[PDB]
Each structure stands twice: as structure tokens, then as C-alpha cells.
Amino acid sequence: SGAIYVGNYRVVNRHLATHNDWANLVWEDSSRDLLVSSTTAQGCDTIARCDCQTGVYYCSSRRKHYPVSFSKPSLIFVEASEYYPARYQSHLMLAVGHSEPGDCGGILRCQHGVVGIVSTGGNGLVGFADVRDLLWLDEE
Ligand SMILES: CNC(=O)c1cccc2cc[nH]c12
Ligand SMILES: [Zn+2]
């Protein structure tokens, strides 16, 4: 589990969004596994605006923050999960590291801020849904 809190937006894994998130929906893309909802209170997080390929991610299933190299966001074939059938996931970044389904929402950060959240995993890879292309998160 986990979320990004930037301005009056909450960024969550689409598959973990709550009734409240859907009632207060701003934007969602099933192909990216992202949903953004509106918040009353201001968040503290800064989104990275960069093409960094090194960062650190939180892995709840290890209670550990791991430094990783990761690929640039791309379209990747993702095997079926409990929430999605096997399909191509867009804006996805891969790193060699430990992920379990419950690790989704773990933040990947670089020197510039939040890069994305854990979305996919298994086979010793972790997949992060990029948010850095979502420029509108920084305003309104
Ligand atoms: C929607 N798919 C998931 O819940 C998922 C997310 C992160 C890691 C793994 C490993 C297998 N499935 C995973
Ligand atoms: Zn960066």
C-alpha cells in the first residue's frame, strides 16, 4: 500500500484506489495502474522532473529502502495478477529488486523527488509506474 501527496492530489495504484478516490477522481489510466484523486489538505511530496535512472524505493515486504538502477518508462508485457489480466502496461520502469503484490504504493525517489510507485513485480524484478510525465500534478 502507499500514495503520493502533491498539492491537492493523491496518487495511488489504480487497483488499490478506495471508494473515496473514485468519488473524488481527477484522472486514471488502467494501462498505467495509476489513479489521482482530489485532497482537502495539501500534500508535502515533490514530483521529480528529470530522466534519472537511479533512485531508492521502499519495499514494505523487507521494511527496507533499496538503491536501484531502473529502465526509462516503457510499454512492458505484464503477467496476469489478481487485479489485471496479462497485458501491456505503459509508463513502466523495471529494476532488479524484491517486490510482492502488497509492496505496491512503495515510492521510488531520486535527487529531484518522487519518480513513481511500485506497481508490478516477481522474477526478481520490481516495476514502478512513472509519474514524472504528469506535469499537471505540480499545479491547480
Ligand atoms: C496488480 N499486480 C500486483 O498486485 C503486483 C504488484 C507488484 C508486485 C507483484 C508481483 C506479482 N504481482 C504483483
Ligand atoms: Zn531525478
Does residue 106 line the site of ligand 1, with CB under 6 A?
no
Q: Has 104 been annotated as catalytic? A: yes
Experimental approach: X-ray
- Pair (133, 66) in one structural domain: yes
Residue carrying C-alpha cell 535527487? 111
Query: How open is the CA angle 117-102-44, to the nearest 5 degrees?
Result: 40
Residues in Cβ contact with 118 at an 8 Å cutoff, skipping those fewer than 6 apart: 2, 57, 59, 99, 103, 104, 105, 106, 108, 126, 127, 128
Q: What is the dihedral of CA 62, 69, 44, 102, to 10 degrees?
A: -30
- Pair (56, 92) in one structural domain: yes
What resolution (Å)?
1.5
**Rounded to whole angstroms, what are the CA distances from 34 to 117, 123, 124?**
9, 22, 22
Does residue 124 line the site of ligand 1, with CB under 6 A?
no
- Pair (38, 83) in one structural domain: no
- Pair (18, 86) in one structural domain: no
Domain count, the chain: 2
Residue carrying C-alpha cell 524484478? 125
Question: In this structure, are residues 17 and 11 in contact, taking their beta carbons and an 8 Å threshold?
Answer: no
Domain that holds residue 27: 3-44
- Pair (74, 33) in one structural domain: no
Which numbered atom of ligand 1 lies nearest the CA of 13?
1
- Pair (7, 67) in one structural domain: no
Does residue 122 line the site of ligand 1, with CB under 6 A?
yes
